[PDB]
Amino acid sequence: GAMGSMERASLIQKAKLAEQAERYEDMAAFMKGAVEKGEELSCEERNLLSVAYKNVVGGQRAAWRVLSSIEQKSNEEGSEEKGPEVREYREKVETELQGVCDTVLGLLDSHLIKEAGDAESRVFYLKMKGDYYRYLAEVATGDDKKRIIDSARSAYQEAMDISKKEMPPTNPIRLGLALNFSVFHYEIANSPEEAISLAKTTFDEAMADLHTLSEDSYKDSTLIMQLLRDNLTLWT
Amino acid sequence: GAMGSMERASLIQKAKLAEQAERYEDMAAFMKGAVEKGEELSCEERNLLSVAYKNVVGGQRAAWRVLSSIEQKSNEEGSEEKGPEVREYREKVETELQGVCDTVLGLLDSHLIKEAGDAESRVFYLKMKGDYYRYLAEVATGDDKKRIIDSARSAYQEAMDISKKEMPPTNPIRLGLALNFSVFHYEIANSPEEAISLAKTTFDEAMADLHTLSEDSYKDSTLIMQLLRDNLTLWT
Amino acid sequence: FPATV
Amino acid sequence: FPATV
Ligand SMILES: *CC(=O)NCC1CCN(C(=O)C2(Nc3ccccc3)CCCCC2)CC1
Ligand SMILES: *CC(=O)NCC1CCN(C(=O)C2(Nc3ccccc3)CCCCC2)CC1
Ligand SMILES: [Mg+2]
Ligand SMILES: [Mg+2]
Ligand SMILES: [Mg+2]
Ligand SMILES: [Mg+2]
């Protein structure tokens, strides 16, 4: 890998600089290099990894949706034939997106998850695994679509099981996992009732545990609780 | 080139899709491919080319400024030594920026400018040549900095000479050229008085010709006149 | 589009 | 930063 010659600490330093510069592709490449050093990631480093790839794939997903909408409109009755270009370019973006997802999934499988023994790290990585299978599912149309969906579900479910046993209901990783798994249910699994039930129960159980928190922990937990409420408002 | 196998019309179609998707790197690569077909560009196609590369280099310039500011702060008395990483990463971004500028300048030299005989096309390309030498000048620190600055000035000056002879004072290409050459004077050539004089004279001569215009031409010209006024307000 | 983190 | 087009 192109980052093989760079010190771990320098890759992390540069990831932080890339974030400040809003250079998320560079940030992701630096963090990939850091992961590939083979040492476990600290909490801060896990967050750098996730922020980098979230921003890269987020941009690809937004572009894919624009292109998919244009393509769908082209296939409506009365739309003039404009040739293969819209499909080709949507495919191009799609393939690049799938590549990024495969890269992230590859880092998780080799070997972040297997070395992650603490609840906070293991849940964080399993949530990421669910998220990147969910992004693959968003664009899947073939023989493997059901298996991709099930891979996301399985990763999220393992993360939920650990989170419920090992973390308080206000833990931001637990909350963010539940938020995202709820979206999986609504948008991917055609299970809006499950999505709504999960968001509601997660919100209410967090509410009941806020009294245990410092002001700073309260801020962190309530931010994500508000996202749960925002989704519930969208869905009800 | 990787676009050598794609039809000119398909490259232009895809550039437009990439713009809608805010995929400016792709947009620029498509437009480079289109230029390399060897045919002259229409007005619409020239605008696609410029929008694509403006957005790519604009992002690089913004990142370079963030990194340069961090680097400058690191070299202040009392700043703790953090090693070569900030300089290295600023250099990385800088080199990529220079590459994009060299690519654009290369398209202009081979062979857009020499084939451009109409005032609107020739002024447009010469303005671009000045702009991309100006971006090189922004990051230049070596033996060639003066020659880079002079290359920008020469390109802008040739464009100004043609524009004044061949185009009305409200022509948007003429206005945008003057706006940018004025910024060159202020930011690159250490000539704020020349910058201010140029912006003022350009604004006033345009004002006097607005009466000749349709409503739609008036809209186009006044938008850029307001940018001239905005700069004058910043500088006075 | 719903919120995720 | 000044306006350019
Ligand atoms: C130690 C460890 O693994 N830390 C992750 C932390 C806690 C959660 N956190 C956030 O609250 C935000 N992002 C996020 C939350 C949950 C899971 C994944 C990411 C919440 C949304 C805004 C940005 C921070 C990140 C740091
Ligand atoms: C026919 C040709 O070469 N057309 C260029 C046109 C006219 C000018 N124009 C614009 O007004 C904007 N951009 C721009 C102006 C002048 C020079 C270069 C670019 C003005 C700023 C907002 C975007 C359009 C582009 C199309
Ligand atoms: Mg495909
Ligand atoms: Mg349940
Ligand atoms: Mg250099
Ligand atoms: Mg003069």
XYZ file of C-alpha atoms and ligand atoms in Angstrom:
538
model
C 0.000 0.000 0.000
C 1.078 3.551 -0.797
C 1.001 4.422 2.925
C 3.269 1.518 3.912
C 6.311 3.751 4.239
C 4.650 6.365 6.484
C 4.750 6.204 10.268
C 1.480 5.330 12.003
C 1.597 8.534 14.032
C 2.229 10.620 10.897
C -0.737 9.011 9.138
C -2.973 9.904 12.103
C -1.551 13.467 12.193
C -2.219 13.849 8.485
C -5.737 12.410 8.784
C -6.487 15.207 11.262
C -5.012 17.825 8.880
C -7.028 16.369 5.984
C -10.194 16.676 8.098
C -9.436 20.357 8.825
C -8.920 20.855 5.039
C -12.125 18.958 4.195
C -9.991 16.505 2.129
C -11.994 13.408 3.062
C -10.552 11.118 0.355
C -7.072 11.871 1.675
C -8.326 11.451 5.243
C -9.683 8.004 4.391
C -6.484 6.938 2.636
C -4.418 8.031 5.662
C -6.701 6.129 8.026
C -6.609 3.020 5.843
C -2.837 3.220 6.062
C -3.038 3.554 9.837
C -5.342 0.534 10.168
C -3.019 -1.503 7.957
C -0.184 -1.020 10.457
C -1.926 -3.818 12.329
C -2.313 -2.236 15.756
C -5.718 -1.758 17.366
C -7.272 1.746 17.058
C -8.001 4.032 19.968
C -11.388 5.651 20.356
C -10.209 8.868 18.717
C -8.633 6.913 15.851
C -11.835 4.832 15.296
C -13.706 8.133 14.996
C -11.258 9.459 12.441
C -11.680 6.291 10.395
C -15.453 6.514 10.497
C -15.631 10.257 9.743
C -13.341 9.879 6.737
C -15.229 7.034 5.040
C -18.666 8.420 6.038
C -17.898 11.596 4.166
C -16.456 9.819 1.104
C -19.344 7.333 0.780
C -21.870 10.019 1.683
C -20.807 12.044 -1.325
C -20.964 8.953 -3.557
C -24.454 8.042 -2.288
C -25.715 11.568 -2.919
C -24.314 11.467 -6.488
C -25.722 7.991 -7.081
C -29.205 9.175 -6.013
C -29.037 12.155 -8.416
C -28.029 9.874 -11.277
C -30.531 7.135 -10.384
C -33.350 9.725 -10.394
C -32.315 10.959 -13.851
C -32.141 7.338 -15.053
C -35.595 6.511 -13.660
C -37.073 9.586 -15.371
C -35.475 8.472 -18.671
C -37.365 5.162 -18.450
C -40.822 6.850 -18.135
C -43.320 6.818 -21.009
C -42.762 9.801 -23.292
C -39.116 10.323 -22.300
C -36.914 10.668 -25.401
C -34.158 8.030 -25.822
C -30.791 9.593 -24.945
C -28.660 6.447 -25.234
C -26.601 4.477 -22.687
C -24.778 7.404 -21.048
C -26.969 7.935 -17.985
C -26.865 4.204 -17.099
C -23.121 4.068 -17.801
C -22.314 7.014 -15.537
C -24.650 5.791 -12.763
C -22.831 2.436 -13.045
C -19.477 4.197 -12.824
C -20.425 5.987 -9.621
C -22.042 2.817 -8.289
C -18.902 0.756 -8.922
C -16.745 3.353 -7.149
C -19.168 3.353 -4.193
C -19.117 -0.435 -4.010
C -15.330 -0.263 -4.054
C -15.232 2.068 -1.066
C -17.677 -0.185 0.818
C -15.603 -3.257 0.000
C -12.488 -1.426 1.236
C -14.113 -0.542 4.564
C -15.571 -4.041 4.979
C -12.138 -5.426 4.203
C -10.485 -3.390 6.980
C -13.155 -4.578 9.405
C -12.657 -8.212 8.407
C -8.843 -7.980 8.256
C -8.566 -7.588 11.183
C -10.320 -4.891 13.195
C -13.368 -6.839 14.387
C -11.559 -10.000 15.449
C -9.099 -8.034 17.647
C -11.873 -5.853 19.195
C -12.713 -7.262 22.640
C -14.010 -4.258 24.527
C -17.684 -3.514 24.019
C -17.086 0.018 22.783
C -14.696 -1.051 20.045
C -16.553 -4.211 18.993
C -19.953 -2.486 18.838
C -18.422 0.436 16.925
C -16.916 -1.878 14.263
C -19.999 -4.062 13.976
C -22.128 -0.945 13.514
C -19.734 0.109 10.715
C -20.072 -3.356 9.152
C -23.857 -3.007 9.172
C -23.652 0.533 7.752
C -21.391 -0.417 4.777
C -23.490 -3.514 3.955
C -26.522 -1.154 4.137
C -24.824 1.142 1.538
C -24.200 -1.904 -0.658
C -27.875 -2.854 -0.219
C -29.031 0.589 -1.321
C -27.594 -0.079 -4.818
C -28.052 -3.857 -5.035
C -30.396 -5.322 -7.637
C -28.966 -8.833 -8.296
C -28.909 -12.505 -7.081
C -27.074 -11.425 -3.887
C -29.332 -8.537 -2.762
C -31.031 -10.645 -0.050
C -27.659 -11.914 1.255
C -26.317 -8.316 1.313
C -29.356 -7.182 3.314
C -28.947 -10.124 5.660
C -25.259 -9.328 6.157
C -26.185 -5.811 7.262
C -28.927 -7.157 9.575
C -26.592 -9.751 11.135
C -23.857 -7.226 11.848
C -26.346 -4.730 13.364
C -27.970 -7.501 15.430
C -24.672 -8.689 16.911
C -23.827 -5.072 17.749
C -27.260 -4.558 19.366
C -26.899 -7.726 21.451
C -23.492 -6.647 22.828
C -24.620 -3.045 23.344
C -27.658 -4.061 25.366
C -25.581 -6.324 27.647
C -22.504 -4.137 28.063
C -23.374 -0.441 27.626
C -25.809 1.973 29.308
C -28.839 3.038 27.250
C -27.360 6.570 26.887
C -24.034 5.388 25.481
C -23.580 7.372 22.203
C -22.319 4.305 20.303
C -25.388 2.323 21.444
C -27.650 5.229 20.475
C -26.068 5.702 17.050
C -26.239 1.971 16.362
C -29.946 1.933 17.199
C -30.564 5.045 15.088
C -28.887 3.431 12.082
C -30.424 -0.028 12.559
C -33.815 1.678 12.766
C -33.097 3.356 9.405
C -32.048 -0.052 8.030
C -35.455 -1.426 9.051
C -37.325 1.510 7.474
C -35.356 1.975 4.243
C -33.818 -1.418 3.455
C -35.846 -4.185 5.164
C -39.319 -2.782 4.402
C -40.085 -2.910 8.120
C -41.302 0.574 9.120
C -43.038 -0.701 12.255
C -39.820 -2.302 13.484
C -37.976 0.953 12.664
C -40.442 3.040 14.654
C -40.557 0.622 17.624
C -36.760 0.559 17.808
C -36.389 4.324 17.634
C -39.112 4.883 20.281
C -37.827 2.262 22.729
C -34.261 3.487 22.323
C -35.303 7.104 22.931
C -37.386 6.255 25.996
C -34.757 4.028 27.599
C -32.141 6.731 27.074
C -34.415 9.396 28.551
C -34.724 7.349 31.718
C -30.917 7.108 32.154
C -30.009 10.786 31.497
C -30.157 11.525 35.224
C -26.953 9.523 35.707
C -24.893 11.679 33.380
C -22.570 14.649 33.614
C -23.425 17.768 31.616
C -20.985 16.817 28.881
C -22.285 13.217 28.603
C -25.847 14.584 28.632
C -24.967 16.807 25.662
C -23.543 13.866 23.708
C -26.518 11.567 24.396
C -29.246 14.134 23.825
C -27.813 15.116 20.424
C -28.381 11.576 19.141
C -31.715 11.282 20.947
C -32.868 14.280 18.961
C -31.963 12.430 15.727
C -34.138 9.521 16.864
C -37.002 12.000 17.506
C -36.380 13.627 14.104
C -36.788 10.254 12.373
C -39.875 9.395 14.397
C -41.381 12.729 13.348
C -40.565 11.974 9.691
C -42.196 8.512 9.979
C -45.339 9.208 12.010
C -6.127 9.017 -22.486
C -8.786 7.052 -20.623
C -11.523 9.002 -22.446
C -10.122 8.226 -25.909
C -12.692 5.520 -26.555
C -15.741 7.631 -25.621
C -17.704 9.660 -28.148
C -17.330 13.438 -27.930
C -21.076 13.874 -27.511
C -21.175 11.254 -24.735
C -18.344 12.998 -22.885
C -20.278 16.288 -23.036
C -23.498 14.528 -21.914
C -21.651 12.964 -19.000
C -19.983 16.258 -18.051
C -23.481 17.722 -17.663
C -24.585 14.732 -15.532
C -21.432 15.048 -13.403
C -22.249 18.735 -12.830
C -25.789 17.845 -11.679
C -24.216 15.252 -9.303
C -21.606 17.746 -8.057
C -18.875 15.318 -9.274
C -16.487 18.029 -10.467
C -13.407 15.783 -10.811
C -15.396 13.536 -13.137
C -16.775 16.596 -14.928
C -13.244 17.863 -15.543
C -12.012 14.485 -16.777
C -14.949 14.265 -19.216
C -14.267 17.773 -20.500
C -10.554 17.065 -20.884
C -11.544 14.075 -22.980
C -13.848 16.254 -25.065
C -11.137 18.865 -25.671
C -8.699 16.127 -26.671
C -10.995 15.103 -29.536
C -9.414 18.063 -31.298
C -12.510 19.975 -32.376
C -13.143 23.548 -31.260
C -15.539 24.005 -28.288
C -18.862 25.783 -28.465
C -19.760 28.461 -25.962
C -21.703 26.012 -23.807
C -18.834 23.508 -23.940
C -16.233 26.192 -22.979
C -18.409 26.950 -19.949
C -18.548 23.308 -18.952
C -14.764 23.104 -19.173
C -14.296 26.196 -17.047
C -16.900 25.242 -14.415
C -15.372 21.792 -13.984
C -11.770 22.917 -13.445
C -12.802 26.014 -11.427
C -14.508 23.780 -8.922
C -11.652 21.244 -8.760
C -8.907 23.874 -8.340
C -11.118 25.939 -6.047
C -11.318 23.049 -3.621
C -7.546 22.513 -3.829
C -6.845 26.222 -3.216
C -9.137 26.259 -0.188
C -7.360 23.174 1.237
C -3.938 24.629 0.472
C -4.836 27.839 2.360
C -5.978 25.837 5.420
C -2.739 23.858 5.416
C -0.528 26.889 4.719
C -2.105 28.708 7.695
C -1.410 25.739 9.984
C 2.168 25.596 8.655
C 2.725 29.328 9.216
C 1.435 29.031 12.795
C 3.852 26.117 13.386
C 6.783 28.384 12.463
C 5.882 31.066 15.088
C 7.952 31.528 18.251
C 6.668 29.273 21.024
C 5.015 26.751 18.687
C 6.022 23.188 19.623
C 7.886 21.192 16.927
C 5.501 18.645 15.388
C 7.823 17.323 12.672
C 7.647 17.405 8.854
C 4.021 16.287 8.432
C 2.320 19.660 7.995
C 4.855 20.742 5.328
C 4.650 17.331 3.643
C 0.855 17.380 3.394
C 0.769 21.032 2.254
C 3.318 20.007 -0.411
C 1.133 17.073 -1.420
C -1.904 19.281 -1.934
C 0.252 21.910 -3.630
C 1.690 19.379 -6.086
C -1.803 18.121 -6.957
C -2.970 21.722 -7.492
C 0.008 22.472 -9.718
C -0.818 19.330 -11.672
C -4.374 20.469 -12.327
C -3.112 23.908 -13.412
C -0.549 22.328 -15.724
C -3.303 20.135 -17.203
C -5.543 23.128 -17.923
C -2.646 25.183 -19.309
C -1.735 22.211 -21.464
C -5.227 22.019 -23.000
C -5.087 25.746 -23.718
C -1.671 25.455 -25.360
C -2.492 22.220 -27.229
C -4.468 23.533 -29.009
C -7.441 25.577 -27.832
C -5.936 29.072 -27.983
C -4.281 28.759 -31.383
C -7.549 27.603 -33.035
C -9.656 30.317 -31.291
C -10.238 33.153 -33.775
C -13.479 34.700 -32.602
C -13.118 37.279 -29.857
C -15.431 35.467 -27.465
C -13.506 32.210 -27.638
C -10.006 33.721 -27.694
C -10.690 36.092 -24.784
C -12.310 33.259 -22.812
C -9.247 30.990 -23.232
C -6.731 33.744 -22.562
C -8.619 34.656 -19.390
C -8.392 30.973 -18.359
C -4.649 31.022 -19.094
C -4.234 34.054 -16.839
C -6.380 32.460 -14.111
C -4.398 29.154 -13.998
C -1.029 30.979 -14.032
C -2.485 33.119 -11.187
C -3.249 29.887 -9.218
C 0.321 28.727 -9.851
C 1.543 32.136 -8.635
C -0.443 31.844 -5.414
C 1.750 28.872 -4.366
C 5.033 29.816 -6.055
C 8.094 30.563 -3.937
C 11.049 29.675 -6.236
C 13.365 30.967 -9.052
C 10.389 31.031 -11.477
C 7.842 32.963 -9.359
C 8.392 36.223 -11.297
C 8.078 34.425 -14.665
C 4.863 32.706 -13.458
C 3.411 36.076 -12.430
C 4.446 37.570 -15.750
C 2.834 34.692 -17.647
C -0.466 35.413 -15.902
C -0.122 39.165 -16.596
C 0.698 38.593 -20.286
C -2.263 36.295 -20.846
C -4.662 38.702 -19.064
C -3.231 41.667 -20.999
C -3.693 40.011 -24.394
C -7.259 39.123 -23.396
C -7.921 42.716 -22.250
C -6.550 44.147 -25.504
C -8.823 41.930 -27.646
C -11.830 42.475 -25.372
C -11.541 46.250 -25.540
C -11.336 46.224 -29.360
C -13.924 43.545 -30.106
C -16.533 43.340 -27.321
C -18.967 45.808 -25.719
C -18.139 46.952 -22.175
C -21.096 44.903 -20.815
C -19.985 41.634 -22.402
C -19.889 39.100 -19.495
C -16.584 37.587 -20.675
C -15.020 41.077 -20.802
C -16.433 41.857 -17.353
C -15.237 38.598 -15.802
C -11.787 39.040 -17.327
C -11.520 42.529 -15.843
C -12.784 41.304 -12.462
C -10.135 38.579 -12.375
C -7.288 40.725 -13.735
C -8.157 43.291 -11.068
C -7.816 40.552 -8.422
C -4.482 39.562 -10.005
C -3.283 43.151 -9.536
C -4.460 43.273 -5.902
C -3.437 39.807 -4.690
C -0.528 38.739 -6.903
C 1.170 41.836 -8.389
C 1.095 43.992 -5.233
C -0.695 46.684 -7.226
C -3.855 47.591 -5.274
C -4.209 50.961 -6.998
C -4.182 49.307 -10.418
C -6.730 46.759 -9.121
C -9.060 49.482 -7.876
C -8.696 51.651 -11.013
C -9.457 48.669 -13.247
C -12.500 47.583 -11.269
C -13.896 51.156 -11.137
C -13.343 51.934 -14.825
C -14.787 48.580 -15.851
C -17.873 49.104 -13.674
C -18.471 52.642 -14.931
C -18.028 51.787 -18.606
C -20.434 48.873 -18.223
C -22.988 51.052 -16.442
C -22.999 53.419 -19.393
C -23.755 50.600 -21.888
C -26.563 48.827 -19.949
C -29.181 50.862 -21.810
C -28.414 48.883 -24.972
C -29.282 45.531 -23.449
C -32.266 43.224 -23.237
C -33.553 42.252 -19.795
C -31.735 38.933 -19.932
C -28.405 40.497 -21.023
C -28.868 43.167 -18.337
C -29.216 40.411 -15.726
C -26.014 38.712 -16.893
C -23.961 41.934 -16.959
C -25.229 43.376 -13.692
C -24.433 40.158 -11.795
C -20.738 40.562 -12.622
C -20.863 44.326 -12.093
C -22.002 43.626 -8.562
C -18.891 41.448 -8.037
C -16.736 44.377 -9.161
C -18.571 46.612 -6.632
C -18.148 43.937 -3.934
C -14.374 43.933 -4.475
C -14.205 47.719 -4.530
C -16.065 47.761 -1.210
C -13.598 45.223 0.231
C -10.628 47.343 -0.960
C -11.720 50.894 -0.133
C -33.808 11.220 3.959
C -33.548 10.005 7.565
C -30.791 10.773 10.033
C -27.863 8.349 10.520
C -24.506 8.784 12.260
C -11.107 36.702 -0.275
C -12.143 38.694 -3.359
C -14.638 37.664 -6.003
C -13.478 35.987 -9.248
C -15.416 34.130 -11.946
C -14.657 5.379 21.961
C -15.414 5.243 20.654
O -15.431 4.157 19.923
N -16.010 6.429 20.456
C -17.059 6.840 19.517
C -17.530 8.235 19.967
C -18.931 8.306 20.572
C -20.032 8.631 19.578
N -19.727 9.775 18.692
C -20.728 10.647 18.431
O -21.541 10.862 19.338
C -21.061 11.128 17.007
N -20.838 10.082 15.972
C -21.122 8.711 16.168
C -21.963 8.278 17.209
C -22.232 6.929 17.382
C -21.611 5.994 16.580
C -20.798 6.401 15.544
C -20.523 7.747 15.340
C -22.560 11.513 17.027
C -23.002 12.168 15.732
C -22.227 13.421 15.496
C -20.734 13.125 15.441
C -20.241 12.397 16.689
C -18.426 9.621 18.021
C -17.316 9.436 19.041
C -19.804 32.058 -25.331
C -18.835 31.980 -24.167
O -17.546 31.791 -24.294
N -19.582 32.142 -23.063
C -19.206 32.405 -21.671
C -20.501 32.782 -20.929
C -20.628 34.243 -20.502
C -20.141 34.534 -19.094
N -20.645 33.590 -18.074
C -21.026 34.103 -16.881
O -21.545 35.225 -16.889
C -20.575 33.503 -15.537
N -19.196 32.944 -15.582
C -18.133 33.533 -16.303
C -18.193 34.870 -16.737
C -17.138 35.431 -17.440
C -16.052 34.654 -17.789
C -15.969 33.347 -17.358
C -17.006 32.766 -16.641
C -20.618 34.666 -14.516
C -20.359 34.195 -13.097
C -21.397 33.205 -12.684
C -21.404 32.012 -13.631
C -21.588 32.429 -15.088
C -20.395 32.189 -18.449
C -21.012 31.879 -19.802
Mg -23.735 -2.298 -10.991
Mg -37.087 -5.275 20.556
Mg 6.219 22.737 -3.812
Mg -6.148 51.511 -18.007
